[PDB]
Every structure is written in C-alpha cells, then in structure tokens.
Amino acid sequence: TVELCGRWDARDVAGGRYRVINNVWGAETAQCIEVGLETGNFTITRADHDNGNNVAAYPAIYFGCHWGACTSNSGLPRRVQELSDVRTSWTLTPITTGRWNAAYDIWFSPVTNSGNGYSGGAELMIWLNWNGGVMPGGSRVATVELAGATWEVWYADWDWNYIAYRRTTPTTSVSELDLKAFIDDAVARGYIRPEWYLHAVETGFELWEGGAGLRSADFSVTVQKL
C-alpha cells in the first residue's frame, strides 16, 4: 500500500482501469489516504477537516474522465442515449463520528471535453450512507423506488444540474447496482438530456468534518453500449 497526503495526489489502480484521488478541493486542512494498488481499496488515515457547512474534500475512486484526466480504456465519454447497461459495486466501512457522506458522483455534459469542468451539464449523486446531520444540496422534489430501494430525490439548479438520490435508509454495500435506472429517472424529470455524455462514475466520501477510519473497497464499474 501507499499513503497519499498531497492535496491533489493520485494513483492509477487495477491496471489503470480506475484512479484514486485524495482530492482535498475545498480546504487546506491535512488529509491522507492509504491505497491498495491492485484494487484501489483505500482507508482515510488522516483527516483534520473542520470546514463548517462547506465540503472540505472528496477522496474518491473513479472510472472515466475527471476534469480531463481519464482512466485507461473506459469507453467514456459516451452519450446517454447510447448506453444499454451501467453497473457498479462498492463496499464502504462507516465510522460513528464526523460529518460526511458515502456517495457516488456521476458527471454529465453536452460536450466531449471535460478539461474545464461540466458547466451546462449535470452532477448525479447517489448517497448510500452519512453521519453528522449532513444533507444534499437544493431541495427534495420526490421520493421514488429505484433499483431495489427507495430514494429521496434532491434537485438544485446551479451552473450544472445537481441531482442527488439519497437512500431512505443507509446501507454499506451495493453489488451490480443499476446506475442506468437512476440515469433514466433523471432523464424523465428533464434533469439530464439523452444527447449528453456520461464522463465519469466516481464514488467516495464528501468530508465536512473529520473522516479518519472510513474505508472504500470492492469498487467496480462496467458500461455496455447499445
């Protein structure tokens, strides 16, 4: 294993299929993650965050293109209308302290270049677990049954459409979760356009306060085209 403490530190894992990023984007407080190079499994070993109501960091593992940095042979970006199946697996180990969430962050945009972000596109989040009273951005517009569970739907109209699906009850693991079901729901609500491209599927922990001890494991993503 290797411990990454740099603000923008990263490591390609699983033969380059995925990439793990320390990603301390919203604060200057210290954070380190210990990463297993073959699997991408990681534990947050240090997190001095105390950022109030703002997110301090999002240590994560991803598949695809994150702000122009792409993983190897992901097959992304690809148009939503051209996807037939999108699946993912993940196992998280929660802690009982701090203010954080365990959530997927999926990016979409009208264009193929993601180097300058995803303005005019959409950010689709799937919250699986959390602690400390943290809540999604925007407001709750619905509660729907999808992919075997019940989810609160939160929406916010920012530079891009923010859509967050929050499980009604927390969980610690998903195996071959049907991501297309969430994409289809978002499309039906007019939050995502079929012509837009899916750029990246990421998962990790948004940290507001603390976070040491959280573990990410068994990450996998598969995409099948029509």
The per-residue DSSP string of the chain comes to: -EEE-STT-EEEEGGGTEEEE----S--S-EEEEE-TTT--EEEEEE--B-TTS--B--EEEEEEETTEEPTT---SEEGGGEEEEEEEEEEE--SSSEEEEEEEEEEESSS--TT--TTSEEEEEEEEEETT---SSEEEEEEEETTEEEEEEEEESSSEEEEEEESS--SEEEEEEHHHHHHHHHHTTSS-TTSEEEEEEEEEEEEE--TT-EEEEEEEEEEE-
Question: What are the residue numbers of the active site?
Answer: 123, 206
Residues 189 and 104: beta-carbon distance below 8 Å: no
In whole angstroms, give the CA distance from residue 69 to residue 115. 8
Q: Closest by alpha carbon to 77, among 104, 113, 120?
A: 113
- Give how far Cα 163 sits from Cα of 99, 219, 225, Å: 20, 22, 23
Q: Which residue has the tokens 């499980």?
A: 167
Number of domains comprising the chain:
1
CA 74 to chain centre: 16
* Radius of gyration of the chain measured on its C-alpha atoms: 16
Degrees to nearest 5, angle at CA 212 with 28 and 137: 65
In the block, tokens 């991501």 appear at 179
Q: What angle do CA 46, 208, 54 make, to 5 degrees?
A: 140
User: Tokens 């697996």 sit at which residue?
Assistant: 89
Sign of CA dihedral 63, 27, 1, 214: negative
- Report the C-alpha gap between 36 and 125 in whole angstroms: 25
- Burial pattern 136-167, b for ≥16 Cβ within 10 A else e, equals bebeeeeebebbeeebbbbbeeeebbbbbbbb
- Report the distance separating Cα 166 and Cα 124, nearest Å: 11
Q: Is there a cis peptide before residue 136, judged by omega within 30 degrees of 0?
A: no
Specify the resolution in Å: 1.8
Task: For strands 173-178 and 42-47, give the pairing.
Answer: unpaired
Kindly report the CATH number assigned to the domain that includes residue 96.
Answer: 2.60.120.180
CA distance 86 to 129: 21
Q: Tokens representing 192? A: 């995502």
Q: Can you tell me the distance from the alpha carbon of 68 to that of 65, in angstroms, rounded to the nearest whole number?
A: 6
CA angle at residue 99 from 59 to 214, to 5 degrees? 45
Nearest of 211, 102, 222, 209 to residue 164 by alpha carbon: 102
| Domain of residue 132, residue span | 1-226
> Taking the chain, what is the end-to-end CA distance rounded to the nearest angstrom?
38
Please report, for residues 22, 32, 48, 136, 176, the alpha-carbon distance to residue 51 in angstroms, rounded to integers and kept in the order given: 17, 17, 9, 16, 34
